[PDB]
Design a protein around this nucleic acid. Structure first.
Ligand SMILES: [Mg+2]
Ligand SMILES: [Zn+2]
Ligand SMILES: [Zn+2]
Lengths: 900, 69, 77, 56
DNA sequence: GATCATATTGTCCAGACAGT
DNA sequence: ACTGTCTGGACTGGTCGGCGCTATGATC
């Protein structure tokens, strides 16, 4: 049968257990001889395992690559204090009597502490608090309650040095060094009944085991030895540390057997203690770390376990996996959000293991008969007994003829196969989704554009990874849970994440704007491009020059479901009167006539009645990320598959619109007439005059301190406020003098790409350059640059750039903008590390929380963190703008459904 | 975005989740009763009651002599 | 004087009876050690006059559910 | 009664694993689909035999 | 000439601790 | 009972590519 590890019990290894688990005794501080063979009794002994392929292990008889490795033991001449337990040892040394060995507590106190230990349960914090309280109470008693022997304070010196404060016959206070043998002898006197009071297990954590008498040398496999390209074997750091330990132990044994004086024995004991302490942890405080002959410090077991590169993080929590690829991504609007572009070279390398059944026997037989060099083919074949055979040209037909039910065929990646698509860093669960394999003959990955905002991935050389599940359970889990269309709504804010961006928004605005009409050929072409099932063209809206014309709203209406009705305001609202009139007309009748709506239709108010876009222009508020109301309603009211189809169709339609109608930006997009430039210059002169007046008022002393502030930062804040008002006025002038016919203004207003400030910065001014939230001050004495007078606090001398990008900046203003950009870049480069550390901390704090079947969130111990998740038991992904149920939307939709 | 003195943003979130005993630039929001929330004079007087003013801040010049020491 | 329950940040606190405590234990199938803890030196506990070993029922304002019922266990410091 | 996403994924994975090493399909097959697709069609036809144990 | 034992022992935040 | 001081730990992840190092002073 099969068994799993139900629980793990920790403890301290006893010397008897170390001796029993050891397959050999190590006494030679060497690894290999001149010819390269292992030395008997050495660290590289075959009894501890084999790394070289030729050798065969003595203990288990297995060759390299399959021998698990066997531990050894070293009999230390003298006991050595374990550093990791050392401080804990001191605690026990402050809790037990030096003669009787019992704890320094009364019987009643011991019993009361036993009841306290039994009552509280299994919470770790209470146990540590009780242990600390018991240690503090026992450490202040100088008389043993059981024997009456006097006690002395014990001073702990890092890392493994113990001093006992003793008194001579003359009353002088001196320090006696407690040798590890004396410490172990004192620890041996503590009975098993007092161990729970000290936080030690009677049968698993005996204090005498905290002092090392037998050192467990690791197996050969866990510290492997390799041969370099120069023919010289490269030993591990642990091997060198163990060589030093064995040499020092042998020297100590020889000196002890020779009757060496006490000066020799304690010196060698200290050397062995230092070696063992470095072997346990080379980064111990208060000691010099062990270094190689080249001056490189070694990393021992503690550094192997801890750290980012340690076993826990670099090998256990996260590790490299098989059947994975990684390459650059390129855009592909022609594929669905469910599909990923897999290169042919990647597809012919990564293989899906498919078992031969009664329905896929012919397909897998054809895959085997194609071979690894022909697509679609196979690379490996596994028989039911379990031998894997690689398919070459010779046995390609023979294996195909031998194929039967129960065999496994590692076939090439085919269309429709489910694979994982992950981009690093993975800040959220939406950073990986299961896509469908689409095989194309190029070299790069291809990912659909609406799936990019979930990945936070652009196409400026982004690298993305792909993982192919092997087991059927993993493939099913990827297909059902982590499918792309199932994660359109972001659980972080309950809004659309998989959404149209940039050119999708621009094409939607171009199609759905007022006065946008298309010919019959254009309408048929966009219908075919978007893959819509429109068999017959709708009635044309108007006839121009004898030919029919279709409104873009009519074409957009075919995407929406026939029973959809929603009205809202978008970001293109600048005349609230028309929007208010439309809202009032909708409010009275609740089913306004389409002719009545079209009479007073406004691009700033989106209104869809029965799937017909009667008014409004498409922008980021329609199906953009974090703002699309239409996409949010479509996902929640019509499922995810219909939402995915709508997203694909609308993205293709908008791409067709933006491709053939013509979308471009030029140098005249930021061009302004002479009146706008004159107004901007007037604003500049007014701002500099106000700044100079403020400076003069501060100099003459009539400037008023702000409440709680002195002259300097008050004047600085006033100057910054004046410059901000000037920047706002310049931006308002630029917006006034730039119409909606501008493509850059279209992109800024519709929310496709960029902002209004971006156009303002390229046309009107750059504003004031600020560092760390204040004006630029770092530089020379009294000035930032030497081109200004010292002590000048003017706008031009402190980072206020008057000209824009189109007019070109002065060298001083260019330098100030460089300081601002450098500050921004440093801000992001500093923020990323802190954000990642905080994310890791939060994840490790909340990794184990899970909603149970009764709706309660509990920790693995059993403590109910929440009796109901979110206090209402509602998924934030399925929540409506952070609310439980959108009563307004439900009522309106139901009323419209019953009225229609 | 990194960087009155509310120290908001990522450092504020880090301070909150780390359970800092003394947050950087602590700020308290104080509300007044019906007898002090409608006029400026009572609000100023209760603010000066809350405000901890030491004579060192009120002092303008610092000078230590020797004749009276 | 100033009651601590008049603060807008302080939710309503009540003392659960032994029968109500048993009902709470039965409903979630958890022991008395699996409940959230509240210190005996907490100002709400000393305002209620509670002692360790009891269960405090907290009626809190819910931004998503209006009102929510939490449960805590009084423990010694 | 409704099936959660995790329960549905577990059922589909178990059915696909059963189909891979035996367990003939209870419905017709398009002659070339993977066992995962067979489990998907079995779930879509409402013919799955695997139930879900829920605490009570 | 060809071998061979030995090869040294930057900041910030939080918890514990003498001092008054 | 407070207060400044000493000690300890962590400092986002991933990927491509390269460079370079891991003996020696006696002994017959
Ligand atoms: Mg990029
Ligand atoms: Zn072996
Ligand atoms: Zn004693």
């Amino acid at each position: 049968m099969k068994k799993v590890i139900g629980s793990i019990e920790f403890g301290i290894l006893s010397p008897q257990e170390i001796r029993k688990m050891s397959a050999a005794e190590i006494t030679v501080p060497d690894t290999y001889d001149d010819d390269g063979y292992p030395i008997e009794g050495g660290l590289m002994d075959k009894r501890l395992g084999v790394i070289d392929p030729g050798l065969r292990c003595e203990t288990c008889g297995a060759r390299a690559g399959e021998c698990p490795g066997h531990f050894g033991h070293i009999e230390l001449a003298r006991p050595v204090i374990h550093v990791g337990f050392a401080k804990t040892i001191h605690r026990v040394l402050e809790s037990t009597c030096r003669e009787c060995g019992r704890i320094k507590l009364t019987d009643e106190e011991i019993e009361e502490y036993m009841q306290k230990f039994e009552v509280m349960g299994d919470r770790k914090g209470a146990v540590d608090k009780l242990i600390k309280e018991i240690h503090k109470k026992a450490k202040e008693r100088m008389v043993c309650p059981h024997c009456g022997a006097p006690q002395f304070p014990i001073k702990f010196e890092r890392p493994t040095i113990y001093w006992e404060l003793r008194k001579d016959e003359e009353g002088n206070e001196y320090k006696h060094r407690m040798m590890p043998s004396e410490v172990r002898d004192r620890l041996e006197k503590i009975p098993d009944k007092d161990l729970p009071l000290l936080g030690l297990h009677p049968e698993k954590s005996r204090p005498e085991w905290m002092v090392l008498t037998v050192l467990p040398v690791p197996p050969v496999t866990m510290r492997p030895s390799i041969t370099l390209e120069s023919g010289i074997r490269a030993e591990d750091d642990l091997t060198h540390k163990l060589v030093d330990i064995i040499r020092i132990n042998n020297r100590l044994k020889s000196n002890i057997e020779a009757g060496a004086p006490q000066l020799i024995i304690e010196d060698l004991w200290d050397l062995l203690q230092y070696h063992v302490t470095t072997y346990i942890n080379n980064e111990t405080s208060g000691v010099p770390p062990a270094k190689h002959k080249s001056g490189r410090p070694l990393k021992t077991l503690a550094q192997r376990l801890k750290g980012k590169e340690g076993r826990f993080r670099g090998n256990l929590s996260g590790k490299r996996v098989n059947f994975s690829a990684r390459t650059v991504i390129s855009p592909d609007p022609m594929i669905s959000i469910n599909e990923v572009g897999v290169p042919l070279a990647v597809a012919m390398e990564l293989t899906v293991p498919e078992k031969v059944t009664e329905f896929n026997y012919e397909k897998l037989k054809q895959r085997v008969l194609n071979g690894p060099e022909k697509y679609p083919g196979a690379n490996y074949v596994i028989d039911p007994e379990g031998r894997r055979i690689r398919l070459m040209e010779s046995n390609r037909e023979l294996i195909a003829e031998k194929l039967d039910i129960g065999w496994t065929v590692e076939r090439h990646l085919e269309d429709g196969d489910v694979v994982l698509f992950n981009r690093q860093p993975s800040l959220h669960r939406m950073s990986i989704m299961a896509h469908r394999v689409r095989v194309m003959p190029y070299r790069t990955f291809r990912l659909n554009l609406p799936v990019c905002p979930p990945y936070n991935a652009d196409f400026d050389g982004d690298e993305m990874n792909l993982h192919v599940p092997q087991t059927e359970e993993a493939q099913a889990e990827a297909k059902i849970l982590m499918e792309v269309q199932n994660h359109i709504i972001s659980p972080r804010y309950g809004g659309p994440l998989i959404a149209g961006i940039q050119d999708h928004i621009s094409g939607g605005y171009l199609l759905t704007r007022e006065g946008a009409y298309f010919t019959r050929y254009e309408v048929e072409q966009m219908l075919m491009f978007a893959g819509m099932d429109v068999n017959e063209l709708p009635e044309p809206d108007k006839y121009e020059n004898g030919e029919p014309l279709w409104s873009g709203k009519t074409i957009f209406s075919l995407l929406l479901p026939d029973d959809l009705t929603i009205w809202y305001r978008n970001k293109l609202c600048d005349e609230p009167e028309r929007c208010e009139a439309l809202e009032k007309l909708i409010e009275e009748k609740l089913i306004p006539d389409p002719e009545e709506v079209r009479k007073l239709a406004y691009d700033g108010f989106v209104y869809i009645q029965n799937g017909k876009l009667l008014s409004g222009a498409v922008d980021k508020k329609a199906y953009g990320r974090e703002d699309g109301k239409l996409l949010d309603i479509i996902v929640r009211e019509y499922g995810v598959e219909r939402a995915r189809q709508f997203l694909d169709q609308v993205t293709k339609l908008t791409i067709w619109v933006i491709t053939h109608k013509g979308f471009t930006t030029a140098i005249d997009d930021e061009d302004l007439p002479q009146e706008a430039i004159d107004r901007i210059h007037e604003i500049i002169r007014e701002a500099e005059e106000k700044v100079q007046r403020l400076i003069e008022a501060y100099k003459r002393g009539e400037l008023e301190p702000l409440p709680g502030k002195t002259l300097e930062e008050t004047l600085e804040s006033k100057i910054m406020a004046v410059l901000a008002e000037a920047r706002d006025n310049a931006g308002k002038v630029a917006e006034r003098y730039l119409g909606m016919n501008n493509h850059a203004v279209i992109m800024a207003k519709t929310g496709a790409r960029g902002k209004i400030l971006n156009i303002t910065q390229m046309a009107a001014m750059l504003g004031q350059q600020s560092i760390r939230g204040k004006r630029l001050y770092r530089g020379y004495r009294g000035r930032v640059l030497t081109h200004f007078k010292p002590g000048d606090l003017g706008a031009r001398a402190r980072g206020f750039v008057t000209n824009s990008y189109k007019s070109g900046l002065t060298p001083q203003e260019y330098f100030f903008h460089a300081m601002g950009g450098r500050e921004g870049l440093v801000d992001t480069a500093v923020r990323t590390a802190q954000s990642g550390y905080m994310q890791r901390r939060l994840i490790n704090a909340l990794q184990d929380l899970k909603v149970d079947y009764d709706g309660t969130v509990r920790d693995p111990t059993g403590i109910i963190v929440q009796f109901k998740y979110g206090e209402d038991g509602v998924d934030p992904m399925k929540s409506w703008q952070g609310k439980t149920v959108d009563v307004d939307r439900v009522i309106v939709r139901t009323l419209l459904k019953m009225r229609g | 975005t990194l960087n009155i003195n509310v120290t908001l943003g990522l450092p504020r979130i880090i301070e909150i989740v780390d359970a800092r005993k003394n947050p950087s630039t602590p700020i308290m929001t104080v509300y007044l009763d019906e007898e002090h929330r409608y006029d400026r004079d009572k609000a100023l007087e209760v603010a000066r009651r809350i405000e901890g003013t030491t004579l060192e801040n009120l002092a303008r010049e610092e000078t230590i002599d020797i004749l009276n020491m | 004087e100033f009651n601590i329950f008049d603060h807008v940040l302080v939710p309503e606190h009540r003392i659960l009876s032994e029968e109500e405590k048993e009902e709470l234990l039965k409903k979630y199938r958890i022991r008395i050690s699996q409940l959230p803890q509240i210190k005996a030196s907490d100002p709400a506990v000393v305002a209620l006059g509670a002692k360790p070993g009891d269960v405090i029922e907290i009626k809190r304002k819910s931004p998503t559910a209006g009102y929510y019922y939490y449960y805590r266990l009084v423990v010694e410091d | 009664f409704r099936y959660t996403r995790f329960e549905k994924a577990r059922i589909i994975g178990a059915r696909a694993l059963q189909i891979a090493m035996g367990a003939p399909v209870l419905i017709d097959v398009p002659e070339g689909i993977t066992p995962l697709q067979a489990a998907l069609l079995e779930f879509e036809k409402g013919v799955i035999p695997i139930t879900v144990i829920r605490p009570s």
